[PDB]
Design a protein around this ligand. Structure first.
Ligand SMILES: Nc1ncnc2c1ncn2[C@@H]1O[C@H](COP(=O)(O)OP(=O)(O)NP(=O)(O)O)[C@@H](O)[C@H]1O
Ligand SMILES: [Mg+2]
Ligand SMILES: [Mg+2]
Length: 356
């Protein structure tokens, strides 16, 4: 079994995703995404081996007929998904990049001498890295996995196949305290002006934590307003809101549609309703009550009510979120909120392995 990601980090955390070029993985239909992982010889889990983009049904080449059953098997691209580490942990970041580059060289040899065969759980020649296979019911094949033989491909990685995910303490968003927080706050959807706006609205209110309430208000309002902008731009059905009722032609297959995810640029990966927990019951009520007019002064009543209710009932920005991640003290953990960089910016390029 592939170990689950660790959920707790002392400070800000980072994970990476790297889709490989030059090969496919073929597996039975409806298989689990994870088929293995690479760890250090010391035992530290570095990254998972996963199936990513469905490339069609797998057809075992006739010249490689082995009496085995490959019925209903599907071909997918391979994506290497790191186990998160601390953003300032240089050795952990570097070991992940080196282990990914080593595995690409190991894949290059595998498609040359063992094409259309599963990856074997081996140790690297230098003893640094160990492959563990959690699903033996798979094969690795060069190119698109149609031909028995490769085109002598070198297994590679590129910025177009790369993402980075940053986790920070939820209470930090809007404080601009660290370079990571400042990079996240530069997200085009984030409206820092909403912080001072909340303060003006709540002068007569005796709030338990005014600065924290203002930060949460700005973060949530920015997400709710951006969701409404995207639902209108792409014609997305949100709860009971019908884009066709506002003469908008549906133009995406929901919130999880890759082009909708790309429009966020810095994609929230945590369920928005979780942040309410960092506030007192009273402060959370004051924040929530003030969001509704922000939507209603910009969007129709129906779109405003549907976006508000969707996120209130625990709606996700773009499918299954990372909602159990924590930061700070291990004994008294605080909520961490995660963000996916759809395109890795210059500031995070050093966290990604480069073939060249
Ligand atoms: N606590 C954390 N802090 C920072 N990054 C994290 C943390 N937990 C997970 N990540 C990273 O966030 C990403 C998680 O993506 P994941 O949750 O596996 O979704 P997925 O199902 O693989 N995506 P998909 O391709 O749509 O199926 C990886 O880059 C992880 O390394
Ligand atoms: Mg992934
Ligand atoms: Mg991604």
């Amino acid at each position: 079994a592939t170990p689950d990601f660790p959920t707790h980090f002392p400070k800000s955390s980072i994970g990476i995703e790297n889709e490989l070029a030059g090969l496919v993985v073929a597996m039975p239909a409806n298989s689990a995404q994870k088929f293995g992982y690479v760890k250090s010889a010391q035992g530290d889990a570095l990254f998972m081996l996963t199936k990513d983009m469905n490339q069609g049904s797998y057809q075992r080449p006739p010249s490689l007929q082995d009496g085995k059953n490959y019925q209903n098997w599907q071909t997918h691209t391979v994506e290497l998904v790191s186990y998160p580490c601390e953003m300032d942990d240089k050795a952990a970041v570097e070991t992940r990049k080196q282990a990914m580059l080593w595995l690409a060289t190991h894949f290059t040899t595998h498609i040359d001498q063992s094409n259309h065969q599963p990856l074997a759980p081996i140790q690297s020649e230098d003893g640094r890295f160990v492959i563990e296979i959690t699903n033996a019911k798979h094969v690795i094949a060069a190119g698109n996995g149609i031909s028995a033989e490769s085109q002598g491909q070198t297994i590679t990685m590129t910025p177009s196949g790369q993402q980075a995910t940053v986790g920070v303490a939820a209470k930090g968003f809007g404080t601009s305290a660290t370079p990571e927080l400042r990079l996240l706050e530069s997200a085009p959807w984030y409206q820092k002006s909403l912080k001072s706006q909340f303060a003006s609205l709540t002068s007569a209110e005796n709030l338990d934590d005014k600065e924290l309430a203002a930060n949460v208000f700005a973060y949530l309002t920015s997400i709710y307003l951006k969701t409404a902008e995207l639902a209108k731009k792409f014609g997305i059905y949100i709860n009971e809101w019908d884009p066709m009722s506002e003469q908008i032609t549906p133009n995406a297959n929901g919130l999880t549609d890759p082009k909708v995810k790309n429009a966020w640029e810095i994609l929230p990966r945590t369920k928005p309703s979780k942040i309410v927990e960092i506030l007192s019951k009273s402060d959370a009520k004051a924040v929530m009550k003030h969001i509704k007019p922000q939507l209603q002064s910009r969007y129709s009543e129906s779109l405003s009510k549907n976006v508000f209710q969707y996120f209130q009932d625990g709606g996700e920005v773009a499918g299954h979120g990372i909602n159990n991640a924590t930061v700070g003290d291990k004994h008294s953990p605080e909520l961490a909120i995660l963000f996916e960089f759809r395109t890795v910016p210059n500031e995070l390029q050093s966290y990604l392995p480069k073939t060249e």
